[PDB]
Write a protein that binds this DNA or RNA. Sequence first.
RNA 1: AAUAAAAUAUUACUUUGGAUAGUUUAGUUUCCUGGGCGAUGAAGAACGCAAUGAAUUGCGAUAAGUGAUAGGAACAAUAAAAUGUGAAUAUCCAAAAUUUGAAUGCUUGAAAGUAUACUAAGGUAUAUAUGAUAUUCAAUAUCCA
RNA 2: CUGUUGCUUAUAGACGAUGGCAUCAGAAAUCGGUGUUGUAAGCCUCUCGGGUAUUGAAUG
RNA 3: GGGAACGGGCUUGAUUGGAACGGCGGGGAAAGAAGACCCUGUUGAGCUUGACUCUAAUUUAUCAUGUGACACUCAUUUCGUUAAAUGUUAAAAAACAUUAAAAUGAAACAGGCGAUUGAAAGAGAUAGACGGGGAGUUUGGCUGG
RNA 4: UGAAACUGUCCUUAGUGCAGAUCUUGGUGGUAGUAGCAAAUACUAAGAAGAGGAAAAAAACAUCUUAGAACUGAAGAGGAGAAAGGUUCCUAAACAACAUUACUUGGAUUAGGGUGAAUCGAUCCUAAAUUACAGAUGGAAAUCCUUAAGAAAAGGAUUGAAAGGGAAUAAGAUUAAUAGUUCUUAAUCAAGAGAAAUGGUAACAUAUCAUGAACUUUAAAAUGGAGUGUGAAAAUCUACGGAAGAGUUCUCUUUUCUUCUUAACAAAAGUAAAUUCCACUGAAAUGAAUCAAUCAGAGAAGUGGAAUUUAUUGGCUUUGUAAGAAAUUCAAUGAAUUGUGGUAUUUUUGCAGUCUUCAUAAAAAUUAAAGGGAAUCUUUUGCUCGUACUAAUAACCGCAACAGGUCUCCAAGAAGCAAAAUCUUUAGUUAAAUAGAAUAACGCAGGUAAGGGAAGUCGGCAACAUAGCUCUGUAAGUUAGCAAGAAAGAGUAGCUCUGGUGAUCGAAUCAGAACUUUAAAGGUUAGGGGAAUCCGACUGUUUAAUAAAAACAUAGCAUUCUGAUAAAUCUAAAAGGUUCAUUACAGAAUGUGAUUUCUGCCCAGUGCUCUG
RNA 5: GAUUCACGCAGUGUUAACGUGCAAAUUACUUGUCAUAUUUGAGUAUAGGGGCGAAAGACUCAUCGAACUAUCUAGUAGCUGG
Lengths: 50, 60, 246, 72, 105
Amino acid sequence: TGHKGFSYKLKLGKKIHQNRGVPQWFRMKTGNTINYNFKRRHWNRRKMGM
Amino acid sequence: VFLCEQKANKTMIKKAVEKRYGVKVIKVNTLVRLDGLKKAFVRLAPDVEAMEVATKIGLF
Amino acid sequence: GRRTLSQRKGRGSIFKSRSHHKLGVAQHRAIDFFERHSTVRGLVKSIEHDPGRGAPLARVVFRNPRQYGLDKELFICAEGLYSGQYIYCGSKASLHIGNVLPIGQCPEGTVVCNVESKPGDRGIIARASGNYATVISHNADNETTRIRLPSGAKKTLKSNCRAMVGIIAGGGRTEKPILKAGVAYRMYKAKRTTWPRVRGVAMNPVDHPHGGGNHQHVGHPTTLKRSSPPGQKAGKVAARRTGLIR
Amino acid sequence: TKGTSCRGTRHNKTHILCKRCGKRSWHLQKQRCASCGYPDAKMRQYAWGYKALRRRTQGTGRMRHLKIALKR
Amino acid sequence: AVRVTYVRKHSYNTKSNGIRIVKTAGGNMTVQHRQKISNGVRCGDCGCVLAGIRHIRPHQYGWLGKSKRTVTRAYGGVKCHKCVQKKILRAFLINEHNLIKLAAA
RNA sequence: AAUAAAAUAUUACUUUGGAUAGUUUAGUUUCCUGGGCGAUGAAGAACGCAAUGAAUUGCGAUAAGUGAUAGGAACAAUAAAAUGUGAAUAUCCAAAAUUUGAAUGCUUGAAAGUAUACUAAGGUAUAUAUGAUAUUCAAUAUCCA
RNA sequence: CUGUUGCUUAUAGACGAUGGCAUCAGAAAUCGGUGUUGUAAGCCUCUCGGGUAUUGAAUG
RNA sequence: GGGAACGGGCUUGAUUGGAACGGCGGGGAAAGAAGACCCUGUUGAGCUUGACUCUAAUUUAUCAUGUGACACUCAUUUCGUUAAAUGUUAAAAAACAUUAAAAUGAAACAGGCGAUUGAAAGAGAUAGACGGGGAGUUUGGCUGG
RNA sequence: UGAAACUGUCCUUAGUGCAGAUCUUGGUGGUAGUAGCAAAUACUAAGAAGAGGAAAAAAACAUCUUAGAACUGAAGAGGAGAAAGGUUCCUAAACAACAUUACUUGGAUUAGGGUGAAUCGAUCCUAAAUUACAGAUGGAAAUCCUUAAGAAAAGGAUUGAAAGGGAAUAAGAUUAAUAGUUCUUAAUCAAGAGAAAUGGUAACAUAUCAUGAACUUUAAAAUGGAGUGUGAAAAUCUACGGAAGAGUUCUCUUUUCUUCUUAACAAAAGUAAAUUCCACUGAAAUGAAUCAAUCAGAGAAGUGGAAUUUAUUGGCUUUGUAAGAAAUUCAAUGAAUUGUGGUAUUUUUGCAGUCUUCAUAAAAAUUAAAGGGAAUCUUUUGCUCGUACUAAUAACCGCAACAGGUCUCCAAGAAGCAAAAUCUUUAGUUAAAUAGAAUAACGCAGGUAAGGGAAGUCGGCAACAUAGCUCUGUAAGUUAGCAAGAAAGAGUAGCUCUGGUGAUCGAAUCAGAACUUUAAAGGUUAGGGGAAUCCGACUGUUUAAUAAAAACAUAGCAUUCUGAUAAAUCUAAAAGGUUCAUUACAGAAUGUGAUUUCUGCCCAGUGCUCUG
RNA sequence: GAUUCACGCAGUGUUAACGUGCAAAUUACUUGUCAUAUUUGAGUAUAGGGGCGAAAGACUCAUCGAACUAUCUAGUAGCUGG
């Protein structure tokens, strides 16, 4: 909704921040196994349920 | 246009600008961004030109 | 089996009174010195329609006996009351329609309404439309009087029980035939949830003790003892007689 | 119409986020949380829910103060 | 014709959501917000609408001038002239009757 | 009667798939030593903090870390700056310790807020029950002028 | 020799198949014959007009 | 033909050229579902009823110590108020009524805020009655189904 | 082949040998390049960009611009909101996967950017309801009570609405995207700072004026619906006079089309409709008036006045704002214009009386006035949070870009009784699970048909048929209201005229008369009718997903209990709860089912009851 | 609580379409209904031998002649399969 509580909006912003991939420099670390973030979601694929 | 702390209100942001930059403020409009920061729209007095104030800060 | 509708009515969830637009509680004023030993005067400011009850209500305004200000009351209007009328409450009040007197001051044969069952309890009996109680006899030996209730039963009350002289207004309300199911639906607008009554024979055995089989019939006598448990006390309870009386 | 059609009017939340446990288990009309048992002072735990006990209990979080007291 | 939209975020035609569509410069029409119609003052006795007092919202009576919210008469703004005239006659005639009936008849 | 396109059969090579073999910073069980939380605010939850981070880890407006004590030359994916005038690293220590939560001035839905007193802001204190002491009272409850 | 292909091919046809022709080939308009409708537009008369006509019609 | 009594396979015959396109609804006792009809389980469940055994609610008796010889109130019950004059002495008028003059005004006292009920009734214990409102369970076997 | 562990013998030990369990987990075939990628009318030409229309027509080619042709048709496939979603919004780069072909496109990938309020909302108030301390109750968990139980709270505590109540902001411009929020100009509100008046007969009136405490009272906030009439505005239509631009034009058309506007807040030239009061006088020969009504010696009509309502001040024109904006043109920033009307329709907004209820259709915050008589213009500040986008034939809920479902606001022309069907304008769109060739069967959807006319079939199922309006006419039966649009019959077009219905020029409506034709409601829309029987009286409700009915409800009738400390009844208990803010014309429990007519005999049995 | 049309809604018939569907109940036409016993949003109240029911054993999140979920529980099985 347009109308929302202040703390609810900040939890919406955090979910936007966490919907990002692994940076390139992190993928070049030695002994690295983290290439894709599996905690990723999209608005039309999975509803975050909050 | 500044990025500030969400806990600071329009009166604290106004006083911080005059103290930090030595200008006169006539209007402050604030919005809270999704990432959490508070964007402040600080308008200066007509007798003060923000072109030199921004240059001293380093924007230009 | 299930729980009958009579059992579900006692929890009071959808069966609570629809008492949102009601004017208030209709009763006499609290008994004080000025009404035990003197008389007070009240002005009938207006006559209003209390939702959910058939009789009109009067907004009487007594001034004050002891402090400065007003005492806004809410009586059950007696038939013949009008706006701007002066009514009197007290022991020495005159025998006029609308006045509130102790029941012992009313002569035998007087017609009263809104009688108190216990002195100072602000009216119990004879409060529905067109209803009244009649003073039967007095008894000064024990300070008690006998009145005739609207159902015909006789009751013995203390002589200082208070009542209003006259008939409750709105008589003849039930003599008009409801014609439509819609009118009966509106009648319970400010009352409880009771109206559309499904017969027990039309239910299933789980729902009601009358819930029949292949033919809609009760199957067992419909006259029951008073000691029947709730959920089986359906029909006529402790019926002395039964049928079209002659 | 009890299947696909009746789901169209589902736009009112029964539960929102809880302040104490952080789960979307705060019943709005009941005014209590179905997961942590909010305003009730004690945290809601049951012996038949053995998995629910190992999902949120001591040691499942940061242990900010107790990680120092025990090692001391 | 030119069709309009609500400006505020009230999407329902409630009593406080009244609008008027008026024409503006260039031919386009804008949406106003119109006040609710209010009742006036009534005599405390006869319940008749009093003259000389405007029918405005309760908070708007403070903005009016002092003389614009009352009538220069006894019980002005709470009793009609008929309401008052009977009060004066009731006061004088009852006291006069008591003076002769009782009080050294 | 005839052909071997399809079909069928075996082997080699390749492919789809991930069995088998070799391996293990993970488990299971038994035993030994403790069993050291919280109004001096716990466990849990939320949010935030790295030069380039989304998770995770560590930490709390002094932020992937500060002091002190040990420790002695690294870190690295890339570039910086610092460094034997002390880099990493370790700790029952010191400082500091956001919002909540028993949550405790009042309110709390996803709520934004707000009162008083002490020391404009900032910081403290003010829930309920309860023990001891002090002080101000109430009830002719018992005497009592 | 046969098959493909072309004639947006027919006496054939779901697709294959079948039938015909393939440079003296084929296609096309145009004209004539043959039909349908009912008398066009500009100024009752022009007017048995005008329009259509193989698309699976017949000549040149 | 025989066979588990309606074969694609077995026996004897009829007969057979390999790969298939469009249809089609004869067959594959075609697919969907551990038959829902019937029966058997010493398998259930819903509903009914003087089926057996119980149980809530209701009801009756006894016990649970107020005084004086029916009367009282003092526990107890049900109420009403701003606990606002208790007890004993001394219908002409839809109006206003308050923050007192004056030299107490505006009377004293009670061991009861004002009534109602009352030693009876409520709740407890025990005992009898009633109680599909409800709980648990059962409802033989053989048998040309 | 594979590159780091392993084997033989004897004893000991076992989580020790698989073809099956509709076995478990994983992987993979035939079916099979098969069924399909067929609702939502629809695309075409040129150009651009790109690796991506080639070629013996490989007959089809995604995006953008232009031209053509079209669809939704203003109760929309338009412009915005509430909930829900949560960054899907905007831009650039880029196309591996995803949107049943492909994509240079995208709600998809990557990286950046974006949400500005004293005036809009939340915050504030209370509604149904909800929850505390103390108290009451319980073995316990906990339950009850919400002002009653209290040394608590002048009177009663917390929460409860982004649709209820509510202090105060508008126009224009601006951004790739936000804007009653930014900018320009102009306003408003709240909180701050710098012996006590007149006028009018009266109703009542005076840019603050002109004192007004405790206390009390009144009013407001703040109250259903139907139907009729009517004031004003806007839209549409139209009359007069033009200014500017555009369309058609060898056939005419002094022609068709487009623009000609203006806010909040205030002012007071001119001038309304309705209602209620005041003064004079006193009405019968009774008058006054409305569409309807309704009113009058507790005083009509008349004359003269006062007040209030009419989307801010004061309703409309007009004025300030303010033309300097904006609209439409012209020139290369600068110039031009921006009258007056209508006894027309619709929507909106008020008003006035009428009707209707066994229905009478919120409260509080907060504001004003009264009674009483105690006491003696300038300027400052305005905090917190929401604000992007979709709101649906692709952003929400159904596993999805699902033909399903989901609350509202605004609303053009034709035609018509109509917001119906049909077509169009402003806006949006031509993409929305791929197409090309061919034109078999059998299908799905839509039609027609000789002669006959239900012979088909369980059954007129399906289809046909009737159909608008005006006039004439209309039966039995009947609860006298109806049946009824009964049934049945005649008329209807085009063109040229005439007459009727008003005000001091105008309305579409009705009637009639000539003449002509293909003889006229019918493109779209648009009742088949009659004669009986059964059931239910009627309007209404029902087995979401095989039963819509004769079932349920219903009004009417009848029975039973109950004097309120009661009846019924929830609870383990309870100064506990419900009907009950109640009181027999009431509360509680039942059967039959409108009206009319009638409800016969039986008290043995089982119930129930007794004043025994 | 008259008769009808429209916006909407339903579900009488076709026992039409579809029936590995657009859809775990929809589509088309026909039909009915389309404001006072009307329709509808949000808030709120009622909870499993319970609720709610103009009564169909209907509805209580695709679950109802007793919801969903977890524990007792690897319930027992003279019966079927390996």
